[PDB]
UniProtKB/Swiss-Prot annotation, chain C:
The protein's name in its UniProt record: Fatty acid synthase
Additional comment: The relatively low beta-ketoacyl synthase activity may be attributable to the low 4'-phosphopantetheine content of the protein.
Assembly, per entry: Homodimer which is arranged in a head to tail fashion. Interacts with CEACAM1; this interaction is insulin and phosphorylation-dependent; reduces fatty-acid synthase activity.
Residues the record marks as active site: 96
PTM note: In adipocytes, S-nitrosylation of Fatty acid synthase occurs under physiological conditions and gradually increases during adipogenesis.
Upper lineage: Eukaryota, Metazoa, Chordata, Craniata, Vertebrata
Superkingdom of source: Eukaryota
Organism for this UniProt entry: Homo sapiens
Span of the entire protein shown here: 66 to 161 of 2511
Role, per record: Fatty acid synthetase is a multifunctional enzyme that catalyzes the de novo biosynthesis of long-chain saturated fatty acids starting from acetyl-CoA and malonyl-CoA in the presence of NADPH. This multifunctional protein contains 7 catalytic activities and a site for the binding of the prosthetic group 4'-phosphopantetheine of the acyl carrier protein ([ACP]) domain.
Protein's cellular compartments: Cytoplasm; Melanosome
Tissues/organs with expression: Ubiquitous. Prominent expression in brain, lung, liver and mammary gland.
Disulfide feature: none
């Protein structure tokens, strides 16, 4: 008995704002930001 | 050890709703790879315009298999079609499914995709828990065991495109050692996410023309296709219908290769073939037909064919027929083995070998084809008789090989009771199924075995199948009757006349 | 012997499993070379292919190496290929 219709995923169901992390640790590439100190704060 | 026999068979392949339609397409030379854009827009992301696609993925008799509307809507199409195909396969051999309930039957399923789980679980805010139960890859066999009440192992294997034959080999191992009185082997592959096709295109496997031209000089790549196939295995004492007997099934991995992970090594395949047919005690001459992998690649085909030539054609004086089911329906990755097995079994049953398409010239790198040692089936041929070999190789590096002995049981000689009228009873979800069974039984009134097997599968409680109908055969006043059986048990009273 | 581009597109499960398998073989006092060419088999039980779903989300920029390094079957075939194991190499899927 195949009278009904059941959901089947479509082509649009699958993949097809910007977040920037500022890490001042030694290994991180943004380390130079620790040299921008004003009033004794970074 | 105990004999293992392939009893049932069923599946839904490209442009083929059942096995009869699949065979009608195979013999007639119909091309089951289509250019229509059903799954996704044709030519998307540069993908080939062709692919072997099933006719419909949105039909499921939920009431029968105990799935509520919400659960059915959140179940993988693979699982729904696989439940239906499994019930079809178990009854194909004449075994009533309720006769295996509570036994030690096992379910081995070969699958390599779970796209539905990825699609349903994308939104964390509005997802449903029971989506996992119907989409988790482990549930592609656990659900079958749950419905059919099988106490044996329930596993799902990937095996990297050789999964169907891997599951078949594991089921053969289980039945051979007496652990499982039966086994349900199935393979399912459905194309839903174009990203996977893009990945395969990037790897350099798909063909720009979308054709799996195997054994040919213009082999570029294969055409991804869908497919659901389930096969029932049983010890010979249980099987009513025997399609064939598995003489030996094995496996082995190519191991390290200088070329890389995705380069086949024909020596390993030759070793597998030789070891299998030496352990099984079957001389190379007995082989009549070889179901090569036939992916249509530029490197895999020569290696596979040279390995086959060294393993089998070393001494035989008669040419060994070769062929691939992928020239007709493309290449279903997980279910490649089951499609080949279905083709071989149907060809044996109908007495002819299904021709292979897209074969015009032989690849110069294979000397066997240029010579007469190996002969490709470019047009229908009768079956002389002999063992049949099926081998499936995955791009990961896995290998599988099965040696099948065809079932050759001549029709019985006429008997005095043959002319006697017989009774046929049928049961179906709707009157259409009962009428179909009755009509088919009418068209074969003289086949006692067919009628008996149909009768064995007609004893289902009215709750599951609320329609019924009989048809007396061999009588002048012969006409089918159907009606809807009411629910509720009814006492059976007797009366003796005076 | 995994090139850097292939390494990045490789499932972390496989990356750790290679090392853990080598540590387990040597843990038993066996040299992983004496098993090379044998019919040793590999059985891996996995239930998640999250890495593949992440690497195949942008068809414009996705690379095809992720198929080899992130497929569920490759969680055993990679081990069989590196250690040169000729035995069965499957990837079971039953959960728990």
């Amino acid at each position: 008995d195949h009278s009904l219709a059941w959901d089947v995923p479509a082509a649009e169901d699958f993949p097809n704002a910007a977040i920037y992390n500022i890490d001042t640790s030694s290994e991180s590439p943004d380390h130079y930001l620790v040299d921008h100190t004003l009033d004794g704060r970074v | 050890p105990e004999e293992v026999v392939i009893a049932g068979m069923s599946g839904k392949l490209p442009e083929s709703e059942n096995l009869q339609e699949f065979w009608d397409n195979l013999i007639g030379g119909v091309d089951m790879v289509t250019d229509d854009d059903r799954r996704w827009k044709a030519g998307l992301y540069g993908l080939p315009r062709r692919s072997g696609k099933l006719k419909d993925l949105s039909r499921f008799d939920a009431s029968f298999f105990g799935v509520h509307p919400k659960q059915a809507h959140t179940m993988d199409p693979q699982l729904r079609l696989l439940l239906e195909v499994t019930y079809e396969a178990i009854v194909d051999g004449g075994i009533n499914p309720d006769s295996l309930r509570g036994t030690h039957t096992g379910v081995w399923v070969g699958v390599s995709g779970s796209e539905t789980s990825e699609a349903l679980s994308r939104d964390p805010e509005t997802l449903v828990g029971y989506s996992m139960v119907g989409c988790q890859r482990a549930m592609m066999a656990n659900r079958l065991s749950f419905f059919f009440d099988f106490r044996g192992p329930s596993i799902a294997l990937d095996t990297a495109c050789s999964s169907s034959l891997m599951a078949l080999q594991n089921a053969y191992q289980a039945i051979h050692s007496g652990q499982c009185p039966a086994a349900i082997v199935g393979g399912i592959n459905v194309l839903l996410k174009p990203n996977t096709s893009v990945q395969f295109l990037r790897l350099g496997m798909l063909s720009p023309e979308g054709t799996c031209k195997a054994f040919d000089t213009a082999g570029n790549g294969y055409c991804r296709s869908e497919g659901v196939v389930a096969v029932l295995l049983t010890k010979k004492s249980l099987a009513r219908r025997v399609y064939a007997t598995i003489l030996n099934a094995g496996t082995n991995t190519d191991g390290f290769k200088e070329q890389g992970v995705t380069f086949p090594s024909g020596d390993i395949q030759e070793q597998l073939i030789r070891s299998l047919y030496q352990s099984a005690g079957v001389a190379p001459e007995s082989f009549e037909y070889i179901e090569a992998h036939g992916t249509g690649t530029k490197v895999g085909d020569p290696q596979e064919l040279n390995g086959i030539t060294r393993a089998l054609c070393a001494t035989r004086q008669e040419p060994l027929l070769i062929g691939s089911t992928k020239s007709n329906m493309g290449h279903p990755e997980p279910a490649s083995g089951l499609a080949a097995l279905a083709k071989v079994l149907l060809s044996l049953e109908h007495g002819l070998w299904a021709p292979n398409l897209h074969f015009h010239s032989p690849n110069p790198e294979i000397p066997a084809l240029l010579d007469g040692r190996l002969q490709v089936v470019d047009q229908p041929l009768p079956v002389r008789g002999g063992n049949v070999g099926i081998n499936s190789f995955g791009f990961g590096g896995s290998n599988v090989h099965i040696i099948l002995r065809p079932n050759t049981q001549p029709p019985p000689a006429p008997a005095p009771h043959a002319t006697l009228p017989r009774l046929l009873r049928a049961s179906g979800r709707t009157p259409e199924a009962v009428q179909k069974l009755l009509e088919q039984g009418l068209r074969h009134s003289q086949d006692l075995a067919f009628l008996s097997m149909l009768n064995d599968i007609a004893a289902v409680p009215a709750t599951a199948m609320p329609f019924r109908g009989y048809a007396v055969l061999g009588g002048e006043r012969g006409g089918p009757e159907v009606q809807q059986v009411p629910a509720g048990e009814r006492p059976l009273w007797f009366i003796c006349s005076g």
